[PDB]
């Protein structure tokens, strides 16, 4: 017999044909999938009186459990079944309501922002509804749907109720961001942006995807704060961190200016670092869960030896600050001392007038002041061997994976910013953001500048050719520029940064898949010219989009502080050693763009930055950012079961892919990063990778660690993010 | 283990066919001359061609001067020192003869009762009785002790084999069987409390727990309301989780669904309730506490075992002759074997209880192209176990015509014209549609009129030794691998599953099962027919679950699935190492 309990409470009887038809529907177009196998595995779990939702979840999981590299299409079988279940759970039926009826209901419920009904008429919502293709819900993989269900779709946390589907998410994000546009272009932009995101060509960050269309205005996820050498600034910095981490932001903190232990502030940097750490974790579950920061200091700081070991799990508590990451700032001079086997002299920034500023802004002035202060016997100093200091840094980098490098000279000689006016003196949490800052003397200091950046990414696997990036850059740049005027600003100094410079950070995902389908690899130099061509196109079209936006709406108030304003382009200032590793010519008219930028300006002081991805790439079934995948199948733990995702087009490209640990070394990847950096406005979250089993006695030599560090510098790499060590 | 030999000199005195022929000759020796050697020949043929498997004590001892053949004893302890002492004494006598023990100690009053000192010190004393004839406190002698889930001391009782605790609260070298009924499970589903009572404080509650579910709920709720009755309240979700945690960590905390054992039973629970099980959880028989070792009013349950080899029969109708041979051979053993305790002789002579099971079930499914996990074996299992039970009942019914029914036949549901086909868990109707193929209505009348020689005939035990001798898969269990390995002084001992060459793909190995659902449905279908219970295992591979940990949600789900399909007991929980 087998009775089934409906959503109302009544007991109907089991319809095996109806289940079979839904599975048949979900199987359309898929290969190597067995419907009977899914039926056998789920139907054995059915019991008399099982409720309808449980039958749905049982067959979804049944399909999900069969995801493998041999049968990847189970990814899409499970997703479609999950999508079907999500439709009923939200709408009571497969077919979604009319957009207008949906929006009115959701505003009534207080789940959508009422500005939507003010800004658009019923007839415009009717028109927007014609743009929507709800069948694009069938293009998500299972891992994608899980991400949408848990993080993206508007829902009730307490009751578990889901209120929308993915195409309503996409259309309304588009509608909100383009809402202030004139009626002649408005719905044209809405339609094209909708198409771009719903077909995975553009990826948006989680705060946008989850919050844009809702009553929230908290969308800032990336904040850069510079601390001055005063209690007033330390207190302002801490206060600003607390406000931002309560809104879920990642933090980059520059604390390099704080004077060393024993200075005539007597007690040193570490107690203040501890206070920054507690600010960072002030809105976290149990001292860890939530809130994250990376803190920056120069390699020559007097306390550096103590600072390097702050996350070493074997030490005394008053000399450990383990729950922040760290970025060590280095320039040519430091590296030269390493090569020559000489000393590096350590100074407190308070003792060395102009040294700190020159470190970022002027390498000639740095060397003049450094050697001058080295000779001066009245200046407090400590001398250490360069080989020893570098080894300590790299030891801690290797053991934690979270001691980062910033080449501050590269960040300022090859930069959208004039370092005499607006130097880049730190980075963010993930080491791809590179923006000017100014210390605050109070939380509400109007003369301070906290850097903010709004992110997105192009899906390199979803474009058929590079000229498609013209339209996509227009959509991406305009959508994010609109977000800047839309979002809230809890701290005046951060609003100053965002409104003054209008900084954007648009990157990529699916790079590994992109190389695979072009038959290229990371490790052998085969992707060098393709990478050069690709990132020329990205930067060219991003600049063109922002240049055109400036013609239309005006350049950013602080455009005059950019190298762009002076008619200087990234193609003039790149690390010249790149000329030896790629011969690819420029394919776009940069000379015309140069004059057009100098005349009409840019709406946005920066446009590009290469961030890591996880959530965004999962939703598009893309490889993560610019990274090669570790394996063909990704695994994540879930309450709903083991979540698997197979790399895109494994069936045809498994041999074309180069997995992370199949790389013999870091050289090839680092050359690719250098080539990208020629064009990128900010930086790149570049990883280094080491497999102990590739080395004699199973231990990674310091020689190689330093060699790769030096290779990175030589090719103009601005930052180094995670060091990954293969376990085993 | 089998062949008659000298332990000291290493000398072996017989070969296997002499073993088989003489077992046959001894067991059928009191038969009349017209049928005698005909039975001897047919029994010999059955065992020597591996169609019937006999337990080790029979195979090693029948033909020799020994009369110690009882390997399965069930003893119920009363709430008195006299009964505690009688129970301990009876255990010592039986473990010296190599018996496994099922002990019911659920009646012993809780710590603090107006016996003041509680159950655990007495459990410790049962454990030392159990191991009194063992090498070094462990090697030899084994028991499973039973108590109700609602006992006041249950929280302390649940953790008795937890290797991390104080010594005066641990009794680690016995296994445990927790007794549960519908009411306990309902509190779990509803997220309510379970109230704990000492059996000494709750008149009629203990009896009703086994015999009468309506009377249990009437008394339980009545005593829950009564403020004068000592009680502790705990959350049902918490109590069940503690049980299942200990079950998972040890593998040896067992479940007995006591309502199922009495609503679907060869016994009238008003007269002869089933209130415990044995060491391995497949035996389900009436008992009565002793007030002295030689108490003639006590009843210790005994059961004689054997098994059909499902891989050695060409068709199910072969079971007609085999049931005749098996039932008659074992019934003869009952009059042959010795009885060290009067109360155990009372059980055996009164009820003449037998427990005949199966081996080679996995191989049987493989050669029929069926599997455990997908429901594909449901109808075949229904057909198979109908045939087993039908022919076992027919054999015992015919033996009763010839020699008389058992003295206490009138205490059976069989005596009332009630069959297992009337009383099974009705939810089984949803998982198999296989019709009955045998004339149960005729058998019904024939049983009611002529009786059964034996109050029970069937029980599904684990096997190891017996299945090895026939190169059979163990009992009803899927094999862990294609090759079995055992350590030996003579070298590494390997055994390959029967007909691997042709059936390797047809076999479903233990860890190839995606879950327990399919196996549990098969156990439920078997239980429709089986007189006693089944040593049903649950199995969990950590690597199949997120973060490599088995969720309590699934542990409880499988427990509830078992109950819903009428599963009477749960034996080992197996967790894959790795």
């Amino acid at each position: 017999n087998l009775l089934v309990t409906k959503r109302d409470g009544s007991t109907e009887r089991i319809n095996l044909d109806k289940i079979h038809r839904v599975l048949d529907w979900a199987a359309e177009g898929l290969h190597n999938v067995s419907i009977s196998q899914v039926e056998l595995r789920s139907h054995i779990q059915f019991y008399d009186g099982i409720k309808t939702s449980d039958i749905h979840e049982t067959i979804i999981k049944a399909a999900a459990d069969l995801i493998s590299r041999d049968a990847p299409d189970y990814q899409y079988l499970a997703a479609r079944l999950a999508i079907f279940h999500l439709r009923k759970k939200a709408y009571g039926q497969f077919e979604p309501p009319a957009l207008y009826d949906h929006v009115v209901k959701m505003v009534e419920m207080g789940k959508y922002d009422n500005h939507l009904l003010e800004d658009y008429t019923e007839e415009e919502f009717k028109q927007m509804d014609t743009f929507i293709d709800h069948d694009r819900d069938m293009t998500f993989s299972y891992a994608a749907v899980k991400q949408l269900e848990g993080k993206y779709l508007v829902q009730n946390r307490v009751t578990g109720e889901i209120y929308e589907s993915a195409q309503f998410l996409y259309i309304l994000v588009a509608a909100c961001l383009f809402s202030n546009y004139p009626r002649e272009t408005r719905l044209q932009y809405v339609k094209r942006f909708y198409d771009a995101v719903s077909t995975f060509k553009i990826s948006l960050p989680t705060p946008i995807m989850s919050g844009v269309r809702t009553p929230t205005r908290q969308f800032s996820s990336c904040v850069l704060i510079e601390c001055g050498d005063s209690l007033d600034s330390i207190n302002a910095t801490s206060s600003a961190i607390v406000k931002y981490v309560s809104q879920r932001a990642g933090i980059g903190i520059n604390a390099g200016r704080i004077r060393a232990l024993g200075s005539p502030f007597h007690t040193g940097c570490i107690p203040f670092y501890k206070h920054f750490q507690t600010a960072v974790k002030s809105c976290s579950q149990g001292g860890v869960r939530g809130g994250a920061a990376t803190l920056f200091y120069p390699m020559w700081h007097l306390e550096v030896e103590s600072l390097l070991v702050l996350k070493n799990n074997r030490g005394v508590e008053g000399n450990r600050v383990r729950h922040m990451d760290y970025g060590v700032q280095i320039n040519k001079l430091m590296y030269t001392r390493l090569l020559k086997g000489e000393d590096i002299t350590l100074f407190s920034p308070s003792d060395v007038p102009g040294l700190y500023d020159a470190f970022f802004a002027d390498q000639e002035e740095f060397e003049r002041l450094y050697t001058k202060y080295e000779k001066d016997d009245s200046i407090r100093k400590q001398r250490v061997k360069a080989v020893e200091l570098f080894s300590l840094m790299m030891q801690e980098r290797a053991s934690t994976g979270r001691i980062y490098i910033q080449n501050v000279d590269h960040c300022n000689t090859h930069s959208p910013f004039d370092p005499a006016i607006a130097p880049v003196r730190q980075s963010n949490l993930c080491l791809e953001i590179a923006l000017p800052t100014k210390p605050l003397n109070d939380v509400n200091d109007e003369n301070g500048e906290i850097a903010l950046c709004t992110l997105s990414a192009f899906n390199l696997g979803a474009i058929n050719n590079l000229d498609e990036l013209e339209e996509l850059a227009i959509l991406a740049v305009r959508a994010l520029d609109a977000l800047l005027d839309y979002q809230d600003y809890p701290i005046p100094a951060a609003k100053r940064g965002a409104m003054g410079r209008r900084t954007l950070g648009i990157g990529v995902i699916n790079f590994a898949y992109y190389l695979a389908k072009h038959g290229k690899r990371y490790s052998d130099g085969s992707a060098n010219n393709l990478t050069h061509k690709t990132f020329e196109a990205i930067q060219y079209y991003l600049l063109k989009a922002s240049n055109e936006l400036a013609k239309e709406q005006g350049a950013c108030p602080w455009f005059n502080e950019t190298t762009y304003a002076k008619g200087i382009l990234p193609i003039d200032t790149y690390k010249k050693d790149l000329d030896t590793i790629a011969n690819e010519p420029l394919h776009y008219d940069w000379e015309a763009l140069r004059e057009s930028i100098k005349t009409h300006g840019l709406r946005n002081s920066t446009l590009s930055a290469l961030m890591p991805s996880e959530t965004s790439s999962q939703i598009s079934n893309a490889t993560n950012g610019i990274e090669p995948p570790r394996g063909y199948v990704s695994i994540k733990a879930s309450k709903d079961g083991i979540l698997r995702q197979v790399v895109p087009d494994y069936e045809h490209l498994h041999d074309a892919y180069e997995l992370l640990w199949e790389m013999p070394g870091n050289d090839g990847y680092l050359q690719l990063v250098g080539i990208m950096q020629k064009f990128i406005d900010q930086s790149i979250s570049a990883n280094t990778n080491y497999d102990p089993s590739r080395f004699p006695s199973g231990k990674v030599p310091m020689q190689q660690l330093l060699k790769d560090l030096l290779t990175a510098y030589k090719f103009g790499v601005k930052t180094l993010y995670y060091q990954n060590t293969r376990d085993g | 283990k089998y062949l008659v030999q000298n332990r000291v000199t290493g000398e072996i005195y017989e070969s296997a066919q002499f073993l088989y022929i003489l077992v046959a000759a001894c067991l059928f020796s009191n038969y009349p001359r017209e049928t005698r050697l005909q039975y001897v020949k047919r029994f010999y043929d059955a065992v020597s061609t591996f169609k019937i498997s006999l337990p080790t004590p029979i195979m090693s001892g029948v033909r020799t001067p020994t009369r110690q053949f009882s390997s399965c004893v069930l003893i119920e302890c009363g709430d008195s020192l006299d009964s505690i002492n009688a129970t301990s004494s009876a255990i010592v006598k039986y473990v010296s003869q190599r018996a496994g023990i099922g002990i019911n100690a659920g009646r012993i009053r809780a710590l603090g009762s107006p016996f003041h000192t509680g159950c655990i010190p007495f459990y410790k004393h049962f454990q030392t009785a159990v191991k009194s004839c063992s090498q070094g406190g462990v090697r030899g002698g084994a028991a499973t002790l039973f108590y109700p889930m609602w006992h006041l001391e249950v929280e302390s009782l649940l953790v008795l084999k937890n290797n991390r605790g104080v010594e005066g609260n641990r009794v680690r070298h016995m296994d445990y069987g927790v007794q549960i009924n519908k009411l306990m499970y309902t509190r779990l589903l509803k997220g309510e409390d379970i109230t704990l009572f000492s059996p000494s404080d709750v008149p009629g509650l203990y009896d009703a727990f086994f015999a009468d579910q309506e009377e249990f709920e009437r008394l339980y709720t009545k005593y829950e309301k009564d403020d004068s009755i000592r009680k502790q309240r705990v959350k049902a979700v918490e109590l069940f989780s503690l049980m299942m945690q200990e079950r998972a960590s040890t593998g040896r905390i067992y479940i007995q669904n006591v309502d199922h054992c009495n609503t679907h039973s060869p016994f009238d629970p008003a007269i002869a309730p089933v209130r415990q099980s044995n060491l391995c959880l497949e035996i389900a028989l009436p008992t009565k506490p002793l007030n002295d070792v030689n108490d003639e009013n006590g009843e210790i349950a005994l059961c004689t075992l054997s098994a059909f080899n499902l891989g050695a029969i060409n068709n199910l109708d072969e079971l007609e002759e085999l049931a005749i041979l098996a039932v008659r051979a074992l019934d003869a053993l009952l009059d042959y074997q010795d009885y060290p305790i009067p109360a155990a002789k009372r059980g055996a002579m009164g009820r003449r209880t037998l427990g005949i099971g199966v081996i080679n079930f996995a191989y049987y499914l493989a050669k029929h192209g069926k599997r455990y996990s997908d429901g594909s074996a449901n109808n075949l299992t229904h057909k198979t176990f109908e045939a087993i039970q039908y022919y076992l009942l027919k054999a015992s019914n015919e033996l009763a015509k010839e020699q008389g029914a058992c003295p206490w036949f009138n205490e059976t549901t069989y005596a009332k014209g009630i069959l297992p086909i009337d009383t099974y868990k009705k939810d089984l109707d949803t998982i198999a549609n296989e019709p009955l193929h045998y004339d149960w209505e005729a058998l019904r009348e024939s049983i009611k009129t002529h009786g059964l020689r034996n109050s029970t005939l069937s029980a599904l035990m684990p096997s190891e030794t017996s299945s090895q001798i026939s190169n059979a898969t163990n009992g009803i269990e899927p094999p862990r691998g294609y090759v079995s390995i055992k350590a030996s002084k003579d070298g590494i001992l390997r055994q390959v599953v029967p007909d691997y060459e042709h059936l390797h793909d047809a076999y479903e190995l233990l860890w190839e099962m995606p879950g327990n659902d399919g196996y549990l449905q098969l156990v439920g279908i078997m239980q429709k027919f089986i007189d006693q219970s089944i040593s049903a295992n649950t199995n969990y591979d950590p690597s199949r679950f997120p973060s490599g940990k088995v969720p309590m949600q699934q542990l409880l789900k499988d427990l509830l699935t078992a109950y819903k399909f009428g599963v009477k007991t749960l034996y080992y929980q197996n967790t894959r190492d790795g």
Binding site: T5, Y47, D48, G49, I50, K51, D54, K639 | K182, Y185, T186, L188, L189, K190, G191, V237, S241, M244, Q245, A248, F545, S547, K549, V550, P551, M552, Q553, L555, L556, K557, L560, Y563, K564
Partner: peptide, 16 residues
């Protein structure tokens, strides 16, 4: 080890 997570609302559906 075992995950102690119990959803009582998921169980409340079951019929014995």
């Amino acid at each position: 080890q075992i995950d102690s997570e119990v959803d009582t609302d998921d169980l409340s559906n079951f019929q014995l």
